[PDB]
Subunit: 268 residues, 4 copies
């Protein structure tokens, strides 16, 4: 009798055991969902990581920049979940920006080829994935993507911020298409989570000033959040994604749900 009982859900974006998508997948399985996973490039690694999930889940390769992967995706999913079965949920937990577009590298010095790759993977692919999967989604279904509130500029996030602004806009158009299928489309705007890469950035991977700025941001986030914010714990974010995958937010689409401790509602 889990929140997601009987639901078939595709989860993208796992690359380490600290990936937000790993925690989404775990909580969804704890709540009764049957998963299909998609992974990029390092499939041996991803299989070994996802062996630790509560239940077995087929892993499919998906490079969202690869037109062939996208064209075959729905057939490969149907194969994995069985003919006559469709998906009830899709989780997009995919993002990337070349180093030139983040950190201490000057904003103006990011070449457009780099920015374009970042926007391709982080924003356009939300539409790509919806295009591929809506034909095999059930009415009442739910597409969820991960967001980091880009309403205001900030240090170091630079062109990734721009990519998230694009993603929010893409989400509102995907909602128009998804609606034709009886499917919702929404983003979860999460507070900062210490994934491997984030600890790497805080450790100086993209410049000392960038690391210092991110630590300041994390500290301010917990301070502003009326219920606090634990950057080491993705479970509250995973639960929020599962809420959107469930039947309990049936009139919300094209929208953004903030799983950020309430920080964005407070100035100081």
């Amino acid at each position: 009798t889990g929140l997601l009982d009987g639901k078939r859900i595709l989860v993208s974006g796992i690359i380490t055991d600290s990936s937000i998508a790993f925690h989404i997948a775990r909580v969804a399985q704890e709540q009764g969902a049957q998963l299909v996973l998609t992974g990029f490039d390092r499939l041996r690694l991803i299989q070994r990581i996802t062996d630790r999930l509560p239940a077995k889940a087929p892993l499919l390769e998906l490079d969202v920049q690869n037109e062939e992967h996208l064209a075959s995706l729905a057939g490969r999913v149907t194969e994995a979940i069985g003919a006559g079965n469709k998906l009830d949920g899709v989780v997009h937990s995919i993002g990337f920006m070349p180093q030139t577009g983040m950190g201490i590298n000057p904003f103006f010095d990011a070449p457009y080829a780099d920015v374009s790759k970042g926007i391709h993977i982080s924003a356009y692919s939300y539409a790509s994935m919806a295009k591929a999967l809506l034909p095999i989604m059930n009415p009442g279904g739910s597409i969820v993507g991960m967001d980091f509130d880009p309403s205001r500029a900030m240090p170091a996030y630079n062109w990734m911020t721009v990519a998230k602004s694009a993603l929010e806009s893409v989400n509102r158009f995907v909602a128009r298409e998804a609606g034709k299928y009886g499917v919702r489309s929404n983003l979860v705007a999460a507070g900062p989570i210490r994934t491997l890469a984030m600890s790497a950035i805080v450790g100086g991977a993209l410049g000392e000033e960038a690391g210092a700025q991110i630590q300041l941001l994390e500290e301010g986030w917990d301070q502003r959040a009326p219920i606090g914010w634990n950057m080491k714990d993705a479970t509250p974010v995973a639960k929020t994604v599962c809420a959107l995958l469930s039947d309990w937010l049936p009139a919300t689409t094209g929208d953004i749900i903030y799983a950020d401790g309430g920080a964005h509602t407070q100035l100081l």
Copy 2:
């Protein structure tokens, strides 16, 4: 094994069987919640209405303009749910504006005494109720109020719009206080629902032009909503309130969740 199993939840705002709060109460009981109800003025009526709910629930009198009712409320609730027990949830589903502040009556002609009464009941009372009940709420608890998106002006809603703008602001401050108790505070911004009064307004109760404008608004709402909007069905709104009352949005506070078909995310 309901969404709200084991939870003790106070629901205000029932006055007819079409009240949004009636549907909130029904769905919460279907999902395992144990309720306490509060009602204003017509308690015989409200008891008879709430006899139709799936389970029994104590009814307490609460006029939010009455300082004595508010001062005694927590003790009366504790009496009803038993010493040593606290609330896990509170639903504010209360609103009012004198006729001078809505409909075809000119915006400039509403006397401040009338506007002030409207803001008292519709906005300040969200803080009043939180003040009264937070001392008897459990960590992990949830306070939810009902909103109608006031971000833009519109015909006829007039000073009630202003009251909702005030309420949204109040909610962000209540979140600061509630956080000290481990409690969340949020609003659900619902699309238009045909309560008794709304059918009365559409029927011309506050002027012909106002009724005509509201019908146009309802029609445009369903058109804009990517998944449509059924003004005759409060259940999607009730489900959204229950989602916020649950454990599945644990990192959302001071915030607004839109149960409006996605209409506010679309221009046309």
Copy 3:
């Protein structure tokens, strides 16, 4: 050949030589405007203060809570500017909240009578003044009010924040009415300005914690602002108000212009 040449403009809100409205009045006169001033309660004081303005300007009494003052206001203005002449501009620079609604006094402990007085003076009066003056305003005219961005909660501002949220909503409805006269209505959302009272609050007038919080807010504001923010200098705010009073923002109404150094566009 000033920005406001030939324009007749009413300016409310002067009480000291540090009032934002004093600087609005000064800059408007430097730019060729002919002013009428309104003052509350201490008219001897206000006359002596406004003697320092670049040019003479009639002072009229206006308590916005006084129905008689409002009913006579248009006639008294016409008397001062001469029959057959109308106003081109109106500046609302009026705000008040009792001490119970601000500072370290708990948010929940503000009595509604106090909150209501604050909302009356700070929000409803924007509509009151528009109602009184639109009948004596020229097409192409402009009504401007002062705002402090209430989109997010913050320490100490408490119920004044709620009042500003109400004011923003009121402004969008006043724009609907003003449009019938060919008149615009907008707010200027200013950064923090060290008026007498603010220095008093920073000095602890409403509690030590409140003063400490406001200093932190001021410091963060200048840090966030990409062009910086000087809380001791109201002239940039006054210039912005004059821009809205001019003919150079002819397609902006119901809106908010931010004269805040850009701080609200930046997270950190």
Copy 4:
């Protein structure tokens, strides 16, 4: 004694006599500005068009996708305005999206190469131009770009909406860089203007449904606007751009000014 007396301003984006940038250039010259113009591809045409401006202005070639044009731009501008002189203003009035990304062509069918070209020209180039020109801008200067409010999805605008969402985000980062030079960066969000291309789209150039939808949008815009909206008249938009180029909005940056009749502040 014009609004922009003595100011040296670069204006991009003229391609016909109906271009918003043509009207910006005309009004800026009427107000005393000395201009430098930039044009894309059809320089004979653009010269012949700009011969009709009130005063002479040097025309320089600038394809914002051309790295060489951008690298040489500042030197070519300095040549045109004379060594030792710098710019006080820059107007970005540049936008493009391939047909696959707009109109009746399905949202999901736009190839990323097309979307990327659109985002390059419509969003990234705002940063490109700022990078090129900030080194030759005076303190107190102003960079202004043109926006179409992308906060909500709408029919037909499709990926251009996404490009504008990206542009708004870019603007907030350009403000951070520009601030180092004492320069402001802002967008003007205009209502719909009947440029040549728009009349072409309304005439069905991108599909009948798209044309029908745009006409509906135009009609609704004028209806919602409290002061109305004339899609045939760019002058109110041009005046707003000149307001931002002036000294009268000195504390506004990273921001968006709406020259849209107030339509975005009203639901209906």
